A paper describes a structure:
The HLA-B*13:01 allele has been identified as an important risk allele for SCARs induced by a number of drugs, including dapsone (diaminodiphenyl sulfone, DDS). Individuals with predisposition to develop SCARs appear to possess specific human leukocyte antigen (HLA) alleles, which have been found to trigger the condition by mediating drug-induced T cell activation.
However, HLA-B*13:01-DDS-TCR immune synapse that plays role in DDS-DIHS associated T cells activation remains uncharacterized, which makes prevention and treatment efforts more difficult.
Numbering used by the authors:
A (entry chain C): 1 to 99
B (entry chain A): 1 to 276
C (entry chain B): 1 to 9
Write the structure that this text describes.
């Protein structure tokens, strides 16, 4: 029995174009613990993305926060790309500043 | 407020890729304060919050020696679990443990915890009496018999009622500027047209600590639980948490909807509406 | 600080 990750992509603060911020991808509710997460800018992997220390919830499922500094603009597109044993192919969730 | 300390242990086997990884993290409430990882270059229990850094070298030596012992103990436990479930040495498996203590409003023990899981499923738990066990299956019943024979529950009770409470109170005092400060949510409602006919109202709670919160929508004073999209509370990366709740509303009906927020940092529950 | 009691399943 395995559990597939929930995924949310969002900013540390409300987005304002031209102002520096942090781009977060929170993956949670998954089991087993092996997971691969990339943050993308215009389809390309952002380097040196950091993540929180692995831990787990009351239901034993795991969670991680991946994060990097970024400066949002009108046209730049950001996303989080997740792979897990439960997924046939990588799952891509686009950053939407309204969520 | 009501404070808790928890330790989380995980061992993950990986046959063909070395020995099982062993990790430990400690929390006070929603603040991580120590970490250990057998895959670190030089494994050691390490600080993760400013208020634990003042513990002297002998604190770190003891915690590191405990975690290094636990790396070996939980690797043995993974081997035992293979025997208990008739599993081969080819698969990857996970054992997890959580334990710790909750305090009431006066700093006294509210209850203790000690539970384990195997491959993500409950395995054995110490009951709230801190004296008896609940085993999830016939494998855990074998463990229960061993732990009854060795009077394990009595020793865990002594830790949970003694050192766990005493050290949690010490940490709360050393971190009294942060651990004992609730940050209330910053709240607002946004409006997102979906079509000529409907729009999303999204009620936001941002910047709050600790993570517990209640966030709901009402229409004409009636809860909209079945029609609300409620995202999981999520970390912002600055110690605080975020959450939102959204409802799809007919065009022109926005003022029938109210958002309701409860959080420890709020003296009274809040009501908000869309303010165009 | 952590408990020292070793738990062998």
């Amino acid at each position: 029995i395995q559990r597939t990750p929930k995924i949310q992509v969002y900013s540390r603060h409300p987005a304002e174009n031209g102002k520096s911020n942090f781009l977060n991808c929170y993956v949670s509710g998954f089991h087993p613990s092996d997971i691969e997460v990339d943050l993308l800018k215009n389809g390309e992997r952002i380097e040196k993305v950091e993540h929180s220390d692995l831990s787990f919830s009351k239901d034993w499922s795991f969670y991680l926060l991946y994060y990097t500094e970024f400066t949002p603009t009108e046209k730049d597109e950001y996303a989080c790309r997740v792979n897990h044993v439960t997924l046939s192919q990588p799952k891509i969730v686009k950053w939407d500043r309204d969520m | 407020g009501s404070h808790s300390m928890r330790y989380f242990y995980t061992a993950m086997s990986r046959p063909g890729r070395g020995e099982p990884r062993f990790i430990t993290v400690g929390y006070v409430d929603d603040t991580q304060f120590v970490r250990f990882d057998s895959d670190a270059t030089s494994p050691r229990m390490a600080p993760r919050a400013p208020w634990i850094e003042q513990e002297g070298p002998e604190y770190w030596d003891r915690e590191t020696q405990i975690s290094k012992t636990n790396t070996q103990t939980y690797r043995e436990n993974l081997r035992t679990a293979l025997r208990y479930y008739n599993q081969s040495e080819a698969g990857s498996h996970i054992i997890q443990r959580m334990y710790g203590c909750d305090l009431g409003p006066d700093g006294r023990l509210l209850r203790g915890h000690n539970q384990l899981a195997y491959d993500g499923k409950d395995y054995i738990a110490l009951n709230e009496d801190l004296s008896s066990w609940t085993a999830a299956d016939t494998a855990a019943q074998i463990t229960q018999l061993k732990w009854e024979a060795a009077r394990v529950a009595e020793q865990l009770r002594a830790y949970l009622e003694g050192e766990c409470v005493e050290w949690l109170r010490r940490y709360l005092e050393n971190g009294k500027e942060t651990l004992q400060r609730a940050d209330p949510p910053k709240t607002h409602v946004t409006h997102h047209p979906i079509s000529d006919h409907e729009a999303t109202l999204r009620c936001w709670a941002l910047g709050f600590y600790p993570a517990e919160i209640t966030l709901t929508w009402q229409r004409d004073g009636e809860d909209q639980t079945q029609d609300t999209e409620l995202v999981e509370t999520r970390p912002a990366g600055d110690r605080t948490f975020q959450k939102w709740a959204a409802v799809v509303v007919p065009s022109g009906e926005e003022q029938r909807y109210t958002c309701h927020v409860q959080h420890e940092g709020l003296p009274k529950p809040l009501t908000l509406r869309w303010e165009p | 600080r952590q408990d020292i009691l070793d738990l062998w399943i």
